[PDB]
Amino acid sequence: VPYEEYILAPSSRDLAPASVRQVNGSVTNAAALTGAGGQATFNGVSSVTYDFGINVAGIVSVDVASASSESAFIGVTFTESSMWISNEACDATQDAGLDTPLWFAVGQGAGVYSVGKKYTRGAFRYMTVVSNTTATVSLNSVKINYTASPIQDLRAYTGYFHSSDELLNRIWYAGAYTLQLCSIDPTTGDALVGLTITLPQTDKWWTNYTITNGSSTLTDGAKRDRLVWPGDMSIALESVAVSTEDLYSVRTALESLYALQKADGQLPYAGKPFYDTVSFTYHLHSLVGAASYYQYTGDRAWLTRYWGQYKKGVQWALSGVDSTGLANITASADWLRFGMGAHNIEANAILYYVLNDAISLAQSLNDNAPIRNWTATAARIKTVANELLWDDKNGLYTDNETTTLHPQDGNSWAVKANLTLSANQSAIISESLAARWGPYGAPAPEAGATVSPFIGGFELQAHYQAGQPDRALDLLRLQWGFMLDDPRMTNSTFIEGYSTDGSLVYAPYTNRPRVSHAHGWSTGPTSALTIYTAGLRVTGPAGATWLYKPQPGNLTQVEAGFSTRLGSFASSFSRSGGRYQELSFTTPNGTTGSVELGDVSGQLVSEGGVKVQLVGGKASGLQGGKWRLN
Numbered sequence: 001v002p003y004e005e006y007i008l009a010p011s012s013r014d015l016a017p018a019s020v021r022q023v024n025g026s027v028t029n030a031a032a033l034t035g036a037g038g039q040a041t042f043n044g045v046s047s048v049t050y051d052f053g054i055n056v057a058g059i060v061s062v063d064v065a066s067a068s069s070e071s072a073f074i075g076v077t078f079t080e081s082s083m084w085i086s087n088e089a090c091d092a093t094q095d096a097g098l099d100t101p102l103w104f105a106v107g108q109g110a111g112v113y114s115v116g117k118k119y120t121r122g123a124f125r126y127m128t129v130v131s132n133t134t135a136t137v138s139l140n141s142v143k144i145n146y147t148a149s150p151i152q153d154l155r156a157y158t159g160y161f162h163s164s165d166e167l168l169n170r171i172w173y174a175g176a177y178t179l180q181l182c183s184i185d186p187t188t189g190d191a192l193v194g195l196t197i198t199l200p201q202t203d204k205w206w207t208n209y210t211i212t213n214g215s216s217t218l219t220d221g222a223k224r225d226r227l228v229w230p231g232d233m234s235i236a237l238e239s240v241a242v243s244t245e246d247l248y249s250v251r252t253a254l255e256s257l258y259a260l261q262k263a264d265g266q267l268p269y270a271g272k273p274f275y276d277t278v279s280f281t282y283h284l285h286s287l288v289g290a291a292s293y294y295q296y297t298g299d300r301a302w303l304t305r306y307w308g309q310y311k312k313g314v315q316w317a318l319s320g321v322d323s324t325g326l327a328n329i330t331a332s333a334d335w336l337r338f339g340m341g342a343h344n345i346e347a348n349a350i351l352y353y354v355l356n357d358a359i360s361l362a363q364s365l366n367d368n369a370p371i372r373n374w375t376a377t378a379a380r381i382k383t384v385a386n387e388l389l390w391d392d393k394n395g396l397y398t399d400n401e402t403t404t405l406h407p408q409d410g411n412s413w414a415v416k417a418n419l420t421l422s423a424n425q426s427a428i429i430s431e432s433l434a435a436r437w438g439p440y441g442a443p444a445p446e447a448g449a450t451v452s453p454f455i456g457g458f459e460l461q462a463h464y465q466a467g468q469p470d471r472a473l474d475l476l477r478l479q480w481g482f483m484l485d486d487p488r489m490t491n492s493t494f495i496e497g498y499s500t501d502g503s504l505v506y507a508p509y510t511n512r513p514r515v516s517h518a519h520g521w522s523t524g525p526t527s528a529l530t531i532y533t534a535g536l537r538v539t540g541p542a543g544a545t546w547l548y549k550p551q552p553g554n555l556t557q558v559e560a561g562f563s564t565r566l567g568s569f570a571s572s573f574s575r576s577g578g579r580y581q582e583l584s585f586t587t588p589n590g591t592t593g594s595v596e597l598g599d600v601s602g603q604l605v606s607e608g609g610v611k612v613q614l615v616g617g618k619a620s621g622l623q624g625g626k627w628r629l630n
């Protein structure tokens with residue numbers, strides 16, 4: 001396994017805290033609970049906050065060697081961010097109030113106390129052991145069984161990335177570990193058990209809803225929600241594919257979502273047991289997820305199984321396209337952003353992307369009948385979207401035909417999809433989006449004074465696709481170095497969202513501690529750095545066809561790789577002064593692909609010796625194997 005040192009995931013599922021952060025009261029040998037030899041003696045009312053170093057998850061067990069009064073109690077509290085360390089409560093999961101400590105009456109006697117997976121804590125970095133009674137207790141250990149990525153070898157990555165920019169490397173591996181943390185045992189889902197409260201009052205919590213079929217599944221957030229969400233998949237899937245390659249949790253998630261499709265084709269806002277809600281964009285995201293799951297797995301059986309449902313969902317989306325040629329949205333539910341309605345640039349951009357995905361899929365399946373309608377509809381969406389929604393003055397798309405707001409999501413998606421009329425226009429959008437950056441990242445005005453890493457990943461893809469890799473690297477540094485290195489963060493996983501002023505306030509949530517610090521949809525940098533900076537782009541099922549387009553920017557060394565069922569993809573180059581010194585790549589045998597290197601002239605040689613001339617920095621029909629530039 002390459003670059004194992006960067007993999008954050010624990011080397012054992014039997015975890016003890018790494019270090020002692022704080023001792024309140026009189027506690028002997030607190031470090032005993034960190035693996036150091038000995039026992040920890042809590043003498044009366046006391047507490048100790050321990051730090052795991054990384055975000056972890058699982059079931060706590062308290063090994064009591066001794067207790068005094070039959071009324072002795074040891075509590076355990078958990079939190080992701082250091083902001084919420086308390087001897088009286090955990091961080092929050094519900095729309096209001098903090099969650100209660102797990103209270104183990106150690107007064108009954110010695111032994112190991114635990115409440116099992118019903119009280120799984122999905123994410124926490126700091127753990128507080130609390131002695132709230134005057135009694136003296138002696139504890140041999142307080143440990144956790146790590147229950148994330150439940151059926152995987154945690155450090156057996158199949159993908160890797162390593163650049164000359166160490167901050168980027170750490171961002172990549174933090175995103176991978178975030179995704180590992182969001183993959184859970186499906187029987188421990190739904191942290192929103194409650195679907196007004198002050199610190200004295202604590203909220204009961206439990207994880208005992210089976211959200212999907214199978215033995216593993218990828219949810220939106222480790223601590224919460226622990227439901228399946230289609231929108232997050234639009235980043236989570238590709239970031240999983242190039243790192244752990246645990247597409248099984250993605251598949252169970254997607255299958256659970258499709259099991260809930262309605263007779264009109266409408267796909268769910270979220271998996272069970274969330275309220276039945278109509279969301280144009282999230283139905284579309286279910287379609288995007290199916291398409292990209294086929295793209296990376298190449299599972300023809302699975303695609304055949306679900307093609308009828310996919311076409312029904314496409315038709316449900318197309319039922320909204322009106323006389324204008326654009327979709328007229330009547331469902332405000334989206335990524336928790338406001339103002340979702342009417343002729344949204346984001347909805348129609350996702351729709352264009354979806355229609356092109358569907359055309360590609362139907363050509364792969366030789367289902368030519370729906371192709372003409374889909375192609376014509378997509379072309380009309382493009383035309384009328386640029387006629388009615390393009391603001392040439394401000395260089396952005398507006399949210400709809402009757403507003404002055406230019407959204408980050410809509411413009412990002414309009415660049416990611418080929419909705420722009422020209423490459424020049426994509427460049428204008430990239431520049432205008434970058435001009436809005438604040439001291440803490442890219443803003444999403446459609447959701448108020450919010451910075452959304454979710455939308456930040458799509459902005460990254462836009463910047464890369466406009467010809468601005470270094471703009472995207474600057475956004476990576478500015479935003480994700482904040483999410484990684486801010487002292488309030490976790491330094492291992494990525495946050496769900498925050499505010500433009502640098503506060504961890506997330507506008508839709510009044511309960512600030514319920515903001516989860518481990519969300520898969522914030523892992524855009526992993527797939528972005530692998531696909532765009534390193535240049536390894538799958539363009540066919542499981543990599544049957546591919547495209548090598550490294551966009552190094554001002555990077556001097558870049559090495560990356562991942563795997564599919566066809567074989568191993570690898571990229572490696574070193575530059576200086578705007579010229580490649582070395583460039584090599586590997587693709588699975590039997591595949592054919594193309595290369596776009598830029599203002600690079602010379603010849604590519606195969607392992608056999610086949611020589612191909614770069615014409616405009618390009619090449620075509622290239623067989624699979626180890627190729628090098630001379």
Ligand SMILES: *[C@@H]1O[C@H](CO)[C@@H](O[C@@H]2O[C@H](CO)[C@@H](O[C@@H]3O[C@H](CO[C@H]4O[C@H](CO)[C@@H](O)[C@H](O)[C@@H]4O)[C@@H](O)[C@H](O[C@H]4O[C@H](CO[C@H]5O[C@H](CO)[C@@H](O)[C@H](O)[C@@H]5O)[C@@H](O)[C@H](O)[C@@H]4O)[C@@H]3O)[C@H](O)[C@H]2NC(C)=O)[C@H](O)[C@H]1NC(C)=O
Pocket residue numbers: 013145146147148149150151152153185187213214215
């Ligand atoms: C600390 O936490 C860890 C979390 O990982 C616990 O370990 C896990 O325990 C579960 C218990 O079932 C194991 O699940 C089983 O996994 C089988 C495949 O295992 C794969 O991963 C291994 C990783 O090393 C690997 O070595 C192995 O070769 C293989 O690749 C899987 O075939 C089993 O299938 C059962 O479940 C299917 C899903 O439906 C069921 O879902 C729940 C599961 O909880 C169940 O309650 C429900 O009733 C459903 O039946 C089902 O379709 C099948 O018919 C079959 O019943 C099963 O999922 C998991 O592998 C363990 N992971 C690791 C890494 O060990 C660990 O136990 C815990 N500590 C303690 C002390 O308990």
Ligand SMILES: *[C@@H]1O[C@H](CO)[C@@H](O[C@@H]2O[C@H](CO)[C@@H](O[C@@H]3O[C@H](CO)[C@@H](O)[C@H](O[C@H]4O[C@H](CO)[C@@H](O)[C@H](O)[C@@H]4O)[C@@H]3O)[C@H](O)[C@H]2NC(C)=O)[C@H](O)[C@H]1NC(C)=O
Pocket residue numbers: 206208209
């Ligand atoms: C996940 O965990 C939650 C708890 O955190 C759990 O919810 C609890 O479920 C139990 C059932 O397993 C509930 O207990 C029942 O509540 C009903 C309604 O109050 C009562 O009628 C039940 O009485 C039983 O016994 C009676 C005779 O004494 C019978 O007449 C009657 O028919 C019943 O057989 C029993 O008290 C409990 O109220 C809830 N609590 C909460 C807070 O939800 C949930 O079931 C778990 N989900 C799983 C495991 O899938």
Ligand SMILES: *[C@@H]1O[C@H](CO)[C@@H](O[C@@H]2O[C@H](CO)[C@@H](O[C@@H]3O[C@H](CO[C@H]4O[C@H](CO)[C@@H](O)[C@H](O)[C@@H]4O)[C@@H](O)[C@H](O)[C@@H]3O)[C@H](O)[C@H]2NC(C)=O)[C@H](O)[C@H]1NC(C)=O
Pocket residue numbers: 338339340341342399400401402403404405446
């Ligand atoms: C065309 O696009 C325009 C630009 O997006 C749309 O106008 C937007 O409409 C929305 C919805 O009214 C406004 O959203 C704002 O939301 C905040 C917060 O409200 C939310 O949160 C509070 C709690 O804080 C909760 O109580 C609410 O129920 C919401 O869930 C409010 O403070 C604002 O007053 C407002 O409601 C946008 O501000 C608004 N933008 C602009 C520029 O007008 C327009 O709706 C679209 N066209 C159509 C036909 O829908």
Ligand SMILES: *[C@@H]1O[C@H](CO)[C@@H](O[C@@H]2O[C@H](CO)[C@@H](O[C@@H]3O[C@H](CO)[C@@H](O)[C@H](O)[C@@H]3O)[C@H](O)[C@H]2NC(C)=O)[C@H](O)[C@H]1NC(C)=O
Pocket residue numbers: 073103105132133134
């Ligand atoms: C240390 O913490 C434990 C765990 O919370 C405490 O045990 C708890 O004691 C309270 C006492 O009121 C119990 O609350 C409930 O009170 C109502 C009356 O308002 C009563 O009807 C309920 O039956 C219950 O007694 C709570 O259930 C109990 N928790 C457990 C798990 O037993 C303990 O008292 C604390 N010790 C000190 C010294 O603070």
Ligand SMILES: *[C@@H]1O[C@H](CO)[C@@H](O[C@@H]2O[C@H](CO)[C@@H](O[C@@H]3O[C@H](CO)[C@@H](O)[C@H](O)[C@@H]3O)[C@H](O)[C@H]2NC(C)=O)[C@H](O)[C@H]1NC(C)=O
Pocket residue numbers: 315318319320321322323325373374377
């Ligand atoms: C081919 O694709 C087009 C989309 O470009 C589909 O046309 C659209 O179909 C929906 C219903 O599926 C129409 O919505 C309906 O509009 C009428 C008004 O005429 C309204 O009374 C209904 O209640 C409903 O809202 C939509 O207007 C229509 N748009 C256009 C431009 O035709 C068409 O269904 C697809 N055909 C096939 C065979 O897939």
Ligand SMILES: *[C@@H]1O[C@H](CO)[C@@H](O[C@@H]2O[C@H](CO)[C@@H](O[C@@H]3O[C@H](CO)[C@@H](O)[C@H](O)[C@@H]3O)[C@H](O)[C@H]2NC(C)=O)[C@H](O)[C@H]1NC(C)=O
Pocket residue numbers: 418419420421422423
């Ligand atoms: C993304 O969209 C751009 C346009 O916004 C596409 O480039 C355009 O491609 C069309 C054809 O797909 C060109 O229009 C026509 O091409 C035919 C040949 O097929 C020619 O006979 C006509 O005279 C006309 O030129 C158009 O010139 C071209 N424009 C530019 C600026 O490139 C691009 O292909 C799209 N990319 C993807 C991946 O979909």
Ligand SMILES: *[C@@H]1O[C@H](CO)[C@@H](O[C@@H]2O[C@H](CO)[C@@H](O[C@@H]3O[C@H](CO)[C@@H](O)[C@H](O)[C@@H]3O)[C@H](O)[C@H]2NC(C)=O)[C@H](O)[C@H]1NC(C)=O
Pocket residue numbers: 053170490491
């Ligand atoms: C936040 O995370 C970073 C890593 O992403 C932590 O910094 C890292 O700290 C380790 C030590 O725990 C450094 O490696 C060690 O170097 C020592 C020599 O001093 C050696 O004996 C060890 O075997 C190990 O190689 C690592 O270089 C360093 N990396 C960076 C980029 O700082 C940091 O401690 C974390 N901070 C918090 C508050 O969690």
Ligand SMILES: *[C@@H]1O[C@H](CO)[C@@H](O[C@@H]2O[C@H](CO)[C@@H](O)[C@H](O)[C@H]2NC(C)=O)[C@H](O)[C@H]1NC(C)=O
Pocket residue numbers: 022023024046047048049084085086087128
């Ligand atoms: C140990 O006591 C300290 C107080 O010195 C606790 O820290 C406080 O935490 C609250 C949040 O619950 C903050 O609002 C306060 O600002 C903190 N105190 C100070 C002086 O800044 C800490 O939570 C306690 N830790 C344990 C494990 O009991």
Ligand SMILES: *[C@@H]1O[C@H](CO)[C@@H](O[C@@H]2O[C@H](CO)[C@@H](O)[C@H](O)[C@H]2NC(C)=O)[C@H](O)[C@H]1NC(C)=O
Pocket residue numbers: 322323324328329330342
């Ligand atoms: C887009 O959809 C909206 C509803 O989501 C339509 O709004 C209605 O338009 C009719 C026009 O005759 C008005 O009489 C109604 O009062 C409008 N609704 C409301 C709640 O006021 C709108 O017409 C649609 N536009 C297009 C072009 O299809």
Ligand SMILES: C[C@@H]1O[C@@H](Oc2ccc([N+](=O)[O-])cc2)[C@H](O)[C@H](O)[C@H]1O
Pocket residue numbers: 094095192220221225229230231232334335336496521
């Ligand atoms: C649109 C979705 O919003 C969030 O889902 C939640 C739904 C309800 C509540 N709640 O009311 O507790 C909290 C979160 C979550 O970020 C998902 O990733 C995102 O796709």
Ligand SMILES: *[C@@H]1O[C@H](CO)[C@@H](O)[C@H](O)[C@H]1NC(C)=O
Pocket residue numbers: 210211212213214256
């Ligand atoms: C998983 O599937 C079984 C039957 O195969 C079903 O009983 C169970 O409810 C399912 N769990 C879900 C859909 O979360």
Ligand SMILES: *[C@@H]1O[C@H](CO)[C@@H](O)[C@H](O)[C@H]1NC(C)=O
Pocket residue numbers: 470552553554578
């Ligand atoms: C590196 O940054 C400089 C700006 O200092 C820019 O001019 C140059 O184009 C960048 N290099 C590449 C390969 O884009």
